Amino acid sequence: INAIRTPDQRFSNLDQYPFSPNYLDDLPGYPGLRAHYLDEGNSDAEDVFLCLHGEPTWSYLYRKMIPVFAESGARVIAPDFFGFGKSDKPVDEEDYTFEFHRNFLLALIERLDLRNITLVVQDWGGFLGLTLPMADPSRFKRLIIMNACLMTDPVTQPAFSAFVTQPADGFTAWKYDLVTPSDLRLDQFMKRWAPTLTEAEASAYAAPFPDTSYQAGVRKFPKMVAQRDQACIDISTEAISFWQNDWNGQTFMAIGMKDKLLGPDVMYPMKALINGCPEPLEIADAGHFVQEFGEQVAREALKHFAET
């Protein structure tokens, strides 16, 4: 597995990321690759919030949510996918697959022996994260879901495929923005798709990527939304049955109402598939990256769980 590592100095000037690095080595199926994860709050806590990022972000996306979860007395784990953040980065797009990313998550959960998990998901964090509990249901207790769905086939859930082609300024534009430029500047991309970001914050999304050779993982993600392999279809379809029939944990859903990708059109169908999912918190002004209203969401989720 040909991979490269982002030099440490890229992360020297980060804004509002005071969180210390932790690393995992020799995960099964990932020889030679080192993964970065945050591990915050009481290490001996009973509850763990497992926060999974998506495209084209990293654990930085959860910077506003982590302190809220930590202050409630829980442990918080926020891994960077291989190809992202401070994790090692395979150089060939062909190495990135649904299974590559999924099995990594499973290996990390097992290695850290995470239990009493509150799964917190958005975007690819959800497409992958939502398929984890069925593999080891006894480890998972709660779900916080922000703009996410399952990557099933278009016949099974047309809502989880339609967004790919309409509106033009939605996933079509998103994918175009990510896969076409020779010089992909994620600070500019993130300022576009998360317009509340300051330049300091936006710069943190470019930090992992000195140049295009570090971005194979970034390029591959949208191609996997557009073209879903058989493993992805199968696993995502199995997950539907889990959420509908097997899940009996507590759920909190938050929707970025202005999201052109995975807004109400996608999230209401998703709500219906999750047994016991309450009415969603509708954030009227939020877009795809619901986490930029992250403090609010984390605080409201905690209240909801404490209240029921």
| d(C-alpha 152, C-alpha 175), whole Å | 19
199-206 and 186-193 are packed helices; what angle lies between their axes, rounded to 10 degrees? 130
| d(C-alpha 283, C-alpha 256), whole Å | 5
Q: CA 15 from chain center: how many Å?
A: 20
- Please give the tally of structural domains in the chain: 1
Q: CA 156 from chain center: how many Å?
A: 23
| d(C-alpha 104, C-alpha 125), whole Å | 12
CA angle 286/291/296 to nearest 5° reads 80
**How many residues does the structure list for the chain?**
308
Any idea what the CATH number is for the domain that residue 150 is in? Answer: 3.40.50.1820
Count of CB atoms within 10 A of residue 120's CB?
31
**H/E run at residue 52:** strand 48-52
| d(C-alpha 34, C-alpha 3), whole Å | 10
- C-alpha distance across the termini of the chain, in Å: 47
3-state DSSP assignment of residue 146: strand
3-state DSSP assignment of residue 295: helix
> How distant, in Å, are the alpha carbons of 52, 58, 80, 100, 285 from that of 15?
20, 14, 18, 30, 24
Domain that holds residue 145: 1-308
Q: Are strands 48-52 and 117-121 parallel, antiparallel or unpaired?
A: parallel
Instruction: Tell me the H-state helices in the chain.
Output: 66-71, 98-112, 123-129, 159-162, 173-179, 186-193, 199-206, 216-226, 230-241, 264-273, 294-307
Strand partners, 282: 255
Indicate if the alpha-carbon torsion angle 219, 225, 227, 233 is positive or negative: positive
Biggest distance spanned by C-alpha atoms of the chain: 50
Residue 138 CB burial class (10 angstroms; 0-12, 13-18, ≥19): exposed
> How distant, in Å, are the alpha carbons of 51, 147, 157 from that of 299?
15, 17, 31
Helix and strand numbers (H, E) in the chain are 11, 10
Residue in 64, 88, 94 with CA at minimum distance from that of residue 78? 64
Could you tell me the two tokens for 263? Answer: 């807004």
> How distant, in Å, are the alpha carbons of 94, 196, 208 from that of 193?
26, 9, 18
Experimental approach: X-ray
Could you tell me which residues come within 8 angstroms of residue 24 by beta carbon, excluding any fewer than 6 positions away?
34, 35, 37, 108, 111, 112
Q: Which residues are catalytic?
A: 123, 259, 288
Question: Quick one: the chain helix, strand, coil %, rounded to 5?
Answer: 45, 15, 40
| d(C-alpha 142, C-alpha 49), whole Å | 9
Residue in 158, 254, 127 with CA at minimum distance from that of residue 166? 158
Residue in 213, 209, 216 with CA at minimum distance from that of residue 185? 209
Could you tell me the two tokens for 249? Answer: 């944990």
**Looking at this protein, which amino acid is placed at residue 206?**
A
124 is in an annotated binding site: yes
Could you tell me the two tokens for 230? Answer: 């058989």
Could you tell me the two tokens for 188? Answer: 């500019």
Indicate if the alpha-carbon torsion angle 275, 239, 78, 253 is positive or negative: negative
